[PDB]
């Protein structure tokens, strides 16, 4: 059912699958064709096995500009969370090119800010895996605000916690 506890657990299992496969099957094919890996495969390579804990997995954008609200994929274009590398704490975000071409949006941006605040708060390195066609134009200035908030954090965290940019 759905009004039952067991039903709610099954419903979540379904959302996980959808969230874990936000980009279409062909988009992933195109990505692999180019000789690139997916956002998640990249995290799997970097982090110690099973140490990854995803954040905002079910985040969705709040825009209605240019019918963009027709598609609100879970995660909103970027995979974020924490784990460990060689047993040491690391915060990470990985942009998903298969979703809206990886265009940075408001919620997409806040997800990154969250991973950055977590890293400054706990004192661990931040590894950013970049792969984005640019700003998500449909969102206008909201896209600009998100970038600015990231730049500010980059600056404040400068020389505090290591920041490594992986541009693939």
């Amino acid at each position: 059912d759905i009004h039952t506890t067991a039903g709610k657990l099954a419903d979540l299992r379904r959302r996980i699958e959808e969230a874990t496969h936000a980009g279409s099957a062909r988009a992933v094919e195109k990505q692999h064709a180019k000789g690139k890996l997916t956002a998640r495969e990249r995290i799997d390579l970097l982090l110690d096995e099973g140490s990854f804990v995803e954040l905002d997995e079910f985040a969705r954008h709040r825009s209605t500009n240019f019918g963009l609200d027709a598609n609100r994929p879970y995660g909103d274009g970027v995979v974020t969370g924490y784990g460990t590398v060689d047993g040491r704490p690391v915060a990470v975000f990985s942009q998903d090119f298969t979703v809206f071409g990886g265009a940075l949006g408001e919620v997409y941006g806040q997800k990154i800010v969250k991973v950055m605040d977590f890293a400054l708060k706990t004192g661990c390195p931040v590894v950013g895996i970049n792969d984005s066609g640019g700003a998500r134009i449909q969102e206008g200035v909201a896209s600009l605000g998100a970038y600015g908030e990231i730049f500010r954090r980059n600056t404040h965290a400068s020389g505090v916690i290591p920041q490594i940019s992986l541009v693939v």
Binding site: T5, L12, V53, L55, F58, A59, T122
Partner: protein
């Protein structure tokens, strides 16, 4: 033994007070003066015995059957705390096995289908703590909320959790002050705080307003917003209105906020919401005034009484399987234990009193 007159204020300022049933008594004014002044007849025991101060006044944190037990209780209390605020609580590190066990699995079915049916929150708490050991404080006071200590991978943690079995787990004046002082205690002594949420809202009542729930209930939010120790919160089921903000919400500074599929995070109940949202709509067509109301209600709850709207905003960091709660707390505390945060410089705050 006795603690009378102004002497009572010393233990009151201390962090924990443990009494022995029928041996100890605390009161500012004794029976004799109370009678020759108010004409009331009250005995020591009723006036301020161990049971009275552990379940009514809220001044004692434990009532023991004898002195040996009382001593054992303080030794325990001392084992979860550092020697001073300069260091982290004493720890005997031991890696945990994160493979999902049969006990972990029990959490997937602990929440009944009916939203009104209760379950024992003690079970949830024990399933995440080392050896399922939960050292409870103030058990007899404001039973609607649970406070106490435990260990996660050998490291002490404090717990704050609504108890569905008592007064439906509502928040009220007593539960607010009980938990508020406990939270500040853990924070002051560097003890991480884990909070589990299942709160329908605040206990309705003229008495709660007149007794000052406005300023008294505020102490709990202040406690949480002030805390700089790791804060991990798990919403198992209900989280409505202000009570949601109050129960270790991310908005107050909580570091990690998790919710079960069974969580219902919303401004208010479906009925009350539609009566306001669809007043005019429902008003139209007196003919069938009510099945449409019933329809709006069913629709409202199916759309908003879950944790997903909150998850879309990042209010909760993740919606998880109940069986994976122990996993999330273990791994969260590993990364959150290096948390460093400071408040604005001040001599001290001005928490409502």
């Amino acid at each position: 033994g006795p603690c009378a007159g102004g002497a009572v204020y010393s233990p009151a300022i201390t962090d924990f007070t443990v009494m022995v049933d029928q041996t100890s008594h605390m009161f500012i004014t004794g029976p004799d003066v109370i009678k020759t002044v108010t004409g009331e007849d009250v005995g020591f025991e009723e006036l301020g015995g161990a049971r009275t101060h552990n379940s009514t006044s809220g001044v004692a944190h434990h009532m023991a059957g004898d002195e040996k037990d009382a001593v054992e209780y303080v030794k325990q209390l001392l084992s979860y705390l550092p020697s001073n605020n300069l260091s982290e609580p004493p720890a005997f590190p031991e890696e945990a096995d994160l493979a999902v066990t049969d006990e972990d699995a029990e959490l997937d079915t602990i929440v009944p289908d009916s939203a009104n049916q209760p379950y024992d929150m003690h079970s949830v708490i024990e399933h995440v703590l080392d050896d399922a050991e939960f050292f409870e404080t103030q058990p007899l006071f404001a039973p609607n909320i649970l406070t106490g200590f435990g260990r996660v991978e050998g490291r002490p943690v404090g717990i704050v959790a609504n108890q569905p079995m008592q007064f439906a787990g509502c928040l009220d004046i007593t539960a607010s002050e009980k938990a508020a002082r406990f939270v500040r205690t853990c924070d002051a002594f560097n003890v991480p705080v884990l909070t589990f949420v299942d709160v329908p809202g605040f206990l309705p009542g003229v008495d709660q307003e007149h007794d000052g729930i406005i300023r008294r209930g505020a102490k709990l939010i202040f406690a949480y917003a002030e805390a700089t120790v790791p804060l991990i919160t798990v919403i198992t089921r209900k989280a409505f209105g202000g009570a949601y903000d109050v129960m270790g919400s991310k908005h107050l500074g909580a570091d990690l906020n998790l919710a079960w599929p069974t969580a219902q995070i919303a401004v208010m109940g479906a009925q009350g919401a539609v009566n306001i949202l669809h007043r005019r709509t429902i008003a139209d067509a007196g003919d069938d005034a009510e099945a449409t109301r019933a329809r709006l209600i069913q629709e409202y709850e199916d759309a908003l009484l879950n944790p997903y709207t909150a998850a879309e905003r990042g209010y909760v960091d993740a919606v998880i399987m109940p069986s994976d709660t122990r996993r999330h707390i273990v791994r969260g505390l590993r990364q959150l234990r290096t948390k460093r945060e400071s408040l604005p410089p001040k001599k001290h705050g001005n928490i409502p009193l």
